[PDB]
Symmetry: T
Subunit: 83 residues, 12 copies
């Protein structure tokens, strides 16, 4: 398993949670960090757990970023199915 990638992806969501909704540029950067780490996870449950946690942060982000949060969670779910 790529547990280190799950650790870094989980920590990206924790810092993304504590950012104000106005810091759109830092939110966008952490999602790029989160996705890059999540795309290396070979565990289905890990991808789905991060997908449901990412969806929980969608109310905590800018509306422009919320669309990314949705499409990113959709990718992790599709990546879990394809594994």
């Amino acid at each position: 398993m790529s547990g280190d990638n799950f650790l870094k992806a989980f920590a990206a969501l924790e810092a993304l949670a504590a950012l104000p909704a106005s810091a759109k540029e830092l939110q966008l950067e952490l999602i790029k960090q989160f996705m890059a780490e999540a795309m290396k996870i070979g565990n289905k449950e890990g991808l789905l757990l991060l997908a449901e946690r990412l969806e929980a942060l969608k109310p905590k982000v800018s509306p422009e970023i919320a669309v990314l949060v949705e499409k990113a969670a959709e990718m992790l779910k599709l990546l879990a199915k394809a594994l």
Copy 2:
């Protein structure tokens, strides 16, 4: 900004292009590698260029990962609009 990430991501699409449509497992791993590298690209044009090249690969991938390719391209395009 991150041209080395653009190099690895572009090389991922070229190796993906040479894969047979039945090598679903290997195609899926290069997509995970491509998205991991493309997530670190801060140039809007480079993301859109790679997104278009990824969409041209949809007919050559396995039909069970073609949706993932389609969403990965939309993932990159939405990234370019957000940067």
Copy 3:
């Protein structure tokens, strides 16, 4: 005096505490990640802090993993005593 190993180990316990009890597989993987980082810590108070924080997560993990949580924390205290 590591410091950075304490950060990765502490982050591993935070990700471990957020997992459901049914994800023994991610729990086992994060423990292996946590132990790999906790083993590189040359600070006695840090080893005891992580060991205590690890013992608190025993009720929230699967009973098959709980014996690993017990031995992991027990070893961190032995390592702290050896320093």
Copy 4:
């Protein structure tokens, strides 16, 4: 920016969970935090971490408290210079 902001943010959360008596480890986490916050290059995140760093000054040892105050002041100065 993003990768440095993660480890710096994670350094503050581990620092908050330390007891006020583990001074040697508290000092080491701020050295790890300042080494990572010094590579961010963003104004808003530097001010976000500097504000979070100030909130941990009561939870820190009295000797480290002046280090925490001076570290948060420099992240503000670093943010203004950018």
Copy 5:
């Protein structure tokens, strides 16, 4: 495993553009390709690279062609072992 397939596939495309007289550079790209191909845990990727490697036998030096042949036979044996 995928990143090893990337560098191994890129080494073959670079080896393909090399002239037959660049024997020193052909040997080094094969050392590079093998070093990466030995970390591929995918049976299909090894069989593909091995077949691509054998298509390069006429374009490489005759001294290298034996190395090309033995390297392809290794990838098949590694593939069958998986």
Copy 6:
């Protein structure tokens, strides 16, 4: 499955075997190195093999580290049984 971690961990036991029983800090440091590499082994036989080799070295380690060696080998076994 990462044989690279098995190589470092196996090399740690060989250097640990060549140390005198008095080199307490050298033994303790090699064991912290051994465990950090052993926790990243995802093979059942590799963990059980190194755990068996670790118990064979307990007569050669310092009395202070003997209990740590004892629990380190028990950790690797409890690992492989959960893998």
Copy 7:
């Protein structure tokens, strides 16, 4: 690691050849990625191969860079002669 540098330099030219002539920013970044890898090549045939391939890409690059491509291929030739 002479051969690894040649791999990344050759991959840099192939990605540069696939870029549109308007992507001056990407073409620039790839040139710097190419030269950074080309400076680490100690093979005379390798430098002359990449220098002639880089010359072939000069009409395909943004006009602002065609001068920079010319001096880069010039530099790689002067390196091969000095080796």
Copy 8:
């Protein structure tokens, strides 16, 4: 951790050779310097780099000199906390 002392020393030498008008480049080297100096455990090194950082204050841009001043006092307090 003398490896970090080497880079932090090299950062001050590059900072000393910059023109006073290279504000952005000065700011980057100080960000690099503090990232390396924050990993130093030796007391004499933190004080030597702090006294060398203060000697460069007349050579930096007038914005950044305050940041240089606080970065030096930061290294003074770290050496004290050790």
Copy 9:
């Protein structure tokens, strides 16, 4: 050159200590050995490892024994190409 000989030599020592039944672990160590032995530009070292690898052939699984022999033959061909 030397650091790859160290890892390759260390791989054979760990491979020789493996039981004949640990097929998956034997295969991974040869994947590790060959990856390191494929960046050794020393003729004496390649022949040393090739002879040392041939002696491990009775110790390994029958299917790995074929991979062991093909591996020794590659290093000899590498040594002759250098």
Copy 10:
């Protein structure tokens, strides 16, 4: 990138301290200098190093002087392009 300016600046400092006869080492430090100077995204950094690189040309070997020259011209065109 500030880290690349630091390594490139250190390359020029060592290059300036070499004797005029050390052709092989002067050539190697230039390859090291350029490999780091290529990854610099600051105009003032590239022109600063190109200025210092031109000041080293009288002290290097005549064969190396042609590379020192074209490397300074590269960094100027590089700063113009950014």
Copy 11:
């Protein structure tokens, strides 16, 4: 510290298995050994590795034999300086 002792110990193990004729590889492993032995910081580890290095002097070339004796002498001097 412990990882440096590991590679240094592994360097002596591979050095002991080398024939007295592979001088370029014996020389390279010694430079690999000293590169790792310089960053150990443990007085016992330096003296133990210096002893094992001395015991390899009969199995190495007379040219490398003087490198072996001076490398062991320095590890002994380094252990006293700690």
Copy 12:
């Protein structure tokens, strides 16, 4: 040919020269850093240049490190002689 190790070794002697003769623990650390890099140089001119430079630092270092500085310079000259 590792000119990078020459850069790190040259920078080590510059920082060593700027140290006072009293910070023995820091001077000794830079000797260890310098030696670790100087071993992997491989250039006969560079080893003799750093050896001659290192000799010029021997009167400036602490009296205990001077015997180590002397033997360190004799090693680099023996390395360049064996090259």
